[PDB]
Design a protein around this ligand. Structure first.
Ligand SMILES: NC(=O)c1ccc[n+]([C@@H]2O[C@H](COP(=O)([O-])OP(=O)(O)OC[C@H]3O[C@@H](n4cnc5c(N)ncnc54)[C@H](O)[C@@H]3O)[C@@H](O)[C@H]2O)c1
Ligand SMILES: NC(=O)c1ccc[n+]([C@@H]2O[C@H](COP(=O)([O-])OP(=O)(O)OC[C@H]3O[C@@H](n4cnc5c(N)ncnc54)[C@H](O)[C@@H]3O)[C@@H](O)[C@H]2O)c1
Ligand SMILES: NC(=O)c1ccc[n+]([C@@H]2O[C@H](COP(=O)([O-])OP(=O)(O)OC[C@H]3O[C@@H](n4cnc5c(N)ncnc54)[C@H](O)[C@@H]3O)[C@@H](O)[C@H]2O)c1
Ligand SMILES: NC(=O)c1ccc[n+]([C@@H]2O[C@H](COP(=O)([O-])OP(=O)(O)OC[C@H]3O[C@@H](n4cnc5c(N)ncnc54)[C@H](O)[C@@H]3O)[C@@H](O)[C@H]2O)c1
Lengths: 332, 332, 332, 332
């Protein structure tokens, strides 16, 4: 399938890296009004977090050429003015953070594209998570969402645990790395005041919808989960801390067995498992959605427990975008 | 009342700063084999976290003089070889991290001191927390402990909540700043392998006894609490995240009213209260033990809730050491 | 004397802090289209780098009131649409970073202000540096500039050394803390590509005009100095490293004596001197423009030498703005 | 040639990585009293800066097995008690930082080893630098030194420039990343006071012998160079800033040509060259000793210039150790 990209940021660029890594998806066009053709070369070649690109990159005849495949470049602010059709782009990835409703994202179809994928949650487009509800996707749907990074970590874990023991109620905290909507020194952040204070200096509390959204993707758990977040001064990689009460009694060692079996069968590639003494930098550029840390958790008794799971928020999420589009294309 | 210090580190120096500010406690001797007389002047004058000392500091006749008070300096590795009595030291503060049992800390009395206070938890000496059980102290006790920084934050908050609504069960996480037992780059750390990885780079999980210890200080809650910790890259100030279940039903607003009343009456100076949009740097050099953040917490139901409280782990703890010794002395 | 502020950022707010502390300058109006009235209270009360404000701050009748003085608030993007005169603002401080030429800054006079001071270098307005050329100011000048933070550190030091021994030639490097034009993660930065890479992760080279500009402020040194900069991951405080060649021979001790004498006489308050073992945090909220570090420098010969000087780039500069306006007003 | 390692730290472990990468050197024994057999596996597998080892690692029959080669493990404090001979170790790498003179390092020959290489400067063993004086090595010599990380960056650059234009005099500064002799919070550091202040918080000045040592390795430049250092809060990668005066006149573009030619001929693999807009993270795990940055430097005139060169202090240096031992072995 042939693909386009709107917004060449952290997610936009890493999705592009992943597609050339696989060879199931082919990238044929890119739009970003604030990055010119020569500046694109530089930003794709060099990366502070994940390292130099292994391959070749240059500019020839007004196009971007990676490993020898030529790509068409555009520079528009309004999405209705982009000529996707002429270039041959059948699916579009929307990753600017500015167009997350159905009305707004709809503008792409006007330029001659078939379907659109939003790289964030949505107030009204239907949400999917690979491993959990992806089989509910249908070819009547022209606009869809891949949810948030945090929701892709929490959802696979809660499904296994709910199926085998049963969840009565629960509360979540995430300790999360820094992103591009934060600030270097104290400053203006609009309506959300704590989010504008110095990012290199502070621990910062913040809101999250990620836990209530599990209830859309798993109906049975609707109304039984919620949570919050802290932002801390590391540049990539994050962690989930889930505290919950169970229906059926369960020793800690029984919980471990069930999680390892799922990682070796149906959820291979998505949910991992480990007993080593790891820390955050050990998961930099890891491709899983969720990895269970067996040593770091604890139980008060047979009905009340605390569980711990790690995730690369940039590079894990990027690879789930590509997987989603492949599934979709097999149902055309 | 006149006092001695064994260990001139982060706690040892800041206790000394607090006592000169207050003026009920008087410091008359100091022991540290690794810091000579001229080096002591430099370390007390300048501080990276809390700033310059306002006052005068100099060296005269082989003694350390601050605002005109002369202090006797010693350099011994073995605590039994030290002559406290001769210098006139009636209480000793033990803050080296190496002598935390009753056998080991007992050596100070062989040198002619009356009573000893350990600045950390203990396997066998009795523990106290101002505001919670300090009225159970009595004259027969020669060796005592002031517990940990985390236990001084959690204990006051749980006593209010247990008294008014009742705690059935609960689980705790603390997000904590870096300390002097960590390492600048990957290296050896003994039995705890995760503790030696790079402190400037990582989020690091670790164990903590601070929640079980609440059960010794408040007998009724023995066996109903436990928890863990993460270490993150800030130089000072930490936070508690308590998830718990209640006996009597309670709306969020009712919980707020009960906490504000306690802060304004019998726990004034120990427990604070706030509704402003705060972050970690806002509590640097604050003197409270625990401050409730009303905006950051959340409730699932009338029986299931998440509560949030801040603490300066260096400077809050230092001031509680001083308060304890005053109580003690006024009962001799 | 009564004054206005256009741009309530890091400099705009700290100038305001300095004036209330001193008491010769009085603030009566403030303009910032992106910070509303209630948001202003919060940003002035709490500060990550310098700490809480000691005083009272509140909102009453649509005006901002600090220790009982009411201030008029405006919200305009175009500086010509602003009514300075009506509020009683005789001088205006221009600290947005967007209006640094004479055409552009001229718009403030159309609103009824007398004189304007630009808080940055300028292509065409005349530049002044207290201690060096401030006595050349005169009444005919309606628009002026206070130069950059780096130029206020270098200029006083070079004038002493040129007067006593003579400078043939020289080259400068500054190691500088992070500012608000940098980025949290890899991203777009216009014409300067290196400036947009992750600020928490990297050492970053950049250009600076600060050394050539010394040649406008001291005509005799025109064409004999230039330099560059590196940006590093601290939140405040910077350092100068000057390498130079001399006309008259000079031992290191002779250089020290000449610098101490100037600090104790005609440059008191501007140029400091020290022989203690200092580091960067020791100068946080210091009010000098330049402090000579005697231990850190070194000489190859009696004609070839390396000199080292520290500066608080936020709070030192803020106090020089206030001093300039006093001089000006006492000559009306 | 068969090789042993004393001190399994940052350098000790990365040298071991490099030798299995090449296949010119074979590692057969390791000594470290503070890291037991099972702890060695963990520290070699996982790395915060350079990433997971690509290969296999396990423990079998009391030995360490990497990619299937078995290695003998020892646990001694005194180097005279190690049985190098029995294990078959013909050369020994000394990387503890405690044994840097000829007397002290001599103890290894008593255990039955042939020659020793010190991974640091030395008060009396003879020093070498690949690319510059390695051809002066002789088979009469039993104990030798590979100099410091900084000296391996400066020396190759100064040789090219001195040969083509001539150096009359010069002064150096290095901006340098953090290491394991620093501290997480303010504390005791012995005789060097600034070196014990908080490493995550400050810019710290320090001494260096690296520039005078160039005069041993290049006799003609003895007495014409010296310098100093700043330490800053990044975990790896450093930079050199050399300011110097020339004999023969030279335009900037002439200096560039000469440096590029040397990088493509005799000094290929040791000295690099670049015109792109790079920053520090772009050189993480780079194998060169010195890379010239052409955009970042500047000239005041035809006789007076400032030059800039980057270096991975951990991973560049490690690969030069291995190269030295190969050369040596060809002269047996
Ligand atoms: N950073 C993460 O870990 C992460 C994880 C999951 C989801 N996301 C989501 O992905 C989106 C972007 O995240 P990001 O981290 O890549 O931000 P980013 O700033 O790194 O990237 C955004 C890009 O959008 C471009 N852009 C802006 N306006 C545009 C327009 N009108 N037309 C075309 N291009 C435009 C910018 O030039 C920029 O390159 C957000 O909605 C975010 O919620 C981020
Ligand atoms: N920093 C905190 O958050 C905190 C809070 C509460 C309690 N504590 C506890 O206080 C104790 C001290 O902590 P710190 O943070 O000051 O550590 P630190 O390393 O800053 O201080 C320890 C000091 O003890 C000295 N020392 C070592 N051996 C000695 C001996 N034989 N005689 C005299 N002095 C000796 C060292 O030179 C050093 O000055 C620890 O047990 C710690 O757990 C720390
Ligand atoms: N921080 C330093 O070290 C330093 C030192 C000396 C000089 N300066 C200079 O001072 C100037 C301001 O610097 P800063 O560090 O406070 O930046 P900042 O971003 O902290 O402050 C800029 C402020 O200007 C406001 N602004 C933008 N457009 C405006 C408009 N039309 N009207 C009114 N306000 C507007 C923003 O909301 C913001 O509050 C810059 O030119 C900078 O170069 C900075
Ligand atoms: N870090 C760098 O960038 C760098 C660069 C060039 C040279 N060096 C030099 O290499 C040496 C070590 O540097 P490092 O960064 O690897 O320090 P490190 O702490 O990382 O490694 C030192 C190791 O020595 C072991 N050790 C200590 N005493 C011992 C003994 N008696 N016997 C056996 N083993 C012992 C320790 O257990 C530790 O593993 C120093 O001399 C340093 O100057 C370092």
């Amino acid at each position: 399938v042939k693909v386009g990209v709107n917004g060449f940021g952290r997610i936009g660029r890493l999705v592009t890296r992943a597609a050339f890594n696989s060879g199931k998806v082919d990238i044929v066009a890119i739009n970003d009004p604030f990055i010119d053709l020569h500046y694109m070369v530089y930003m794709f070649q060099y990366d502070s977090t994940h390292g130099k690109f292994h391959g070749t990159v240059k500019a020839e005849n007004g196009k971007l050429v990676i490993n020898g495949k030529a790509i068409t470049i555009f520079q528009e602010r309004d999405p209705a003015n982009i000529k996707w059709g002429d270039a041959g782009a059948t699916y579009v990835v929307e990753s600017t953070g500015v167009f997350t409703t159905m009305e707004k994202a709809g503008a792409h179809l006007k330029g001659g594209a078939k379907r659109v994928i939003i790289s964030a949650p949505s107030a009204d487009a239907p949400m999917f998570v690979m491993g959990v509800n992806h089989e509910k996707y249908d070819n009547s749907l022209k606009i869809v969402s891949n949810a948030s990074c945090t929701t892709n970590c929490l959802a696979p874990l809660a499904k296994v645990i709910h199926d085998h023991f049963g969840i009565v109620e629960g509360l979540m905290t995430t300790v999360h790395a820094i992103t591009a909507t934060q600030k270097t020194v104290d400053g203006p952040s609009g309506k959300l005041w704590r989010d504008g204070r110095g990012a290199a200096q502070n621990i910062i509390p913040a809101s999250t919808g990620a836990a209530k959204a599990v209830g859309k993707v798993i109906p049975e758990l609707n109304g039984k989960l919620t949570g919050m977040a802290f932002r801390v001064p590391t540049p990539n990689v994050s962690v989930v801390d889930l505290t919950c009460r169970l229906e059926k009694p369960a020793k800690y060692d029984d919980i471990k067995q069930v999680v390892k079996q799922a990682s070796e069968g149906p959820l291979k590639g998505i949910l991992g498992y480990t007993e080593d003494q790891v820390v955050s930098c050990d998961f930099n550029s890891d491709t899983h959605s969720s990895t269970f840390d067996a040593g770091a958790g604890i139980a008060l008794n047979d009905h009340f427990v605390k569980l711990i799971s790690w995730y690369d928020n940039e590079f894990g999420y990027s690879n789930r975008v590509v997987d989603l589009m492949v599934h979709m294309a097999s149902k055309e």
